[PDB]
Amino acid sequence: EGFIEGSSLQLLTRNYYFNHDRRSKEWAQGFIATFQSGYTPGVVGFGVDAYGMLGLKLYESGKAPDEFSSGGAALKIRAFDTELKLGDQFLSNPVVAGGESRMLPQTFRGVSLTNNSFEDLTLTAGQVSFTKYYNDSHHLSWLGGTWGGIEGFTSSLYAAELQNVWKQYYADVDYTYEIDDNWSLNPGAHYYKTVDSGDSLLGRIDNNTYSLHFAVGYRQHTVTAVLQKVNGNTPFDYINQGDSIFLDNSQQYSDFNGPNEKSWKLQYDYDFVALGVPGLSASASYSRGKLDLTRVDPDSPGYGGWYSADGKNAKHWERDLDLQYVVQGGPAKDLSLRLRWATHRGTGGYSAVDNDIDEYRVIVDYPIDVF
Ligand SMILES: CCCCCCCCOCCOCCOCCOCCO
């Protein structure tokens, strides 16, 4: 289509409300404007992507500082189903993301390469840097791919190096079987290997983390079983934590990722579609985990504070209630409201590591398509 003709600008308005009980509320506006050029015609095309981001409480982006802002752009070059972005850009993959848990995502400065030559295969590579954000600079490079070569099944393999911190490896599989027209099974696994790298700023790291999910769908109902296991004396670690889609036990509050923590969750989801009210969904979860805090090295530079002499039998749990309505028609079409309730308690001195809390979040989201 071409630079002008293929251009699009989106503005995302974000209302964000966060309530915390401890055994502090917060209100914030946010705006994210996104432009994408078309491509100059020819074998090798040229374009531009650019964004700007603002938020205001009603580096530390926002939720704990009265205002925040940022903007950037990247040059894109597209040849043979390969796209190269050079500049500031968003990222989501198993070893790197701006993260979905907070109001504004983090961005990254550098090179990304994405190949779509084969339908069913995505390859990506990259080298970027980023600062520090949410709750000097970092450098990270990754190589990865995602394969779709079978009808109900998907595969991923990724690696990253976070300079002087870690090398991280990740695999996954997801299978879906449709039995009846109303009954389906979704077995799946996530795997993370983590080792220390270079100067080893966080200290020694030898960490293997597993996520198991089994999901029975029946019509609108879906019930899901999760096992998660962290093997090593530091907790599973990743950039921009919370609500991770590469972990089956990542929850509103806790990631159930502590060192040597075994965990499970039972989740229930419902789609109100056939009950007459489409765009309405709800879900509830219960998660339980246990780990032995005596096994942490208290002198571990990055992770030392997980150690507790009195930890031993430490355990915690979380029960999440989640519902969201997207408005599907009229003027507010696409306006989405989402309500989030989490309760978390630990026992066995888990509280020397994390807190007993009750979290309430409300998120109002309005997309605008401007050209
Ligand atoms: C399945 C998508 C292709 C992934 C590109 C390579 C990602 C980098 O991984 C480095 C670590 O991999 C360890 C051994 O890799 C075996 C490579 O061949 C496997 C073929 O799927």
Residue numbers in the entry: 7 to 29, 36 to 70, 81 to 86, 98 to 168, 187 to 422
What does the publication say?
To determine if the phylogenetic subdivision of Occ proteins exists at the structural level, we determined X-ray crystal structures for seven Occ family members (OccD2, OccD3, and OccK2–K6). In fact, OccD2 (formerly OpdC) is closed in the crystal structure. We speculate that the carboxylate in this interaction mimics that of the substrate during transport. Indeed, we crystallized such a closed state for OccD2. All OccD channels, with the exception of OccD4, show good levels of arginine uptake. Thus, remarkably, OccD2 and OccD3, while efficient in arginine uptake, are not uptake channels for carbapenems. OccD channels are highly specific and transport basic amino acids.
Here we show that OprD channels require a carboxyl group in the substrate for efficient transport, and based on this we have renamed the family Occ, for outer membrane carboxylate channels. The transport data demonstrate that Occ channels have a pronounced preference for substrates with a carboxyl group, due to the universal presence of a basic ladder on one side of the barrel wall.
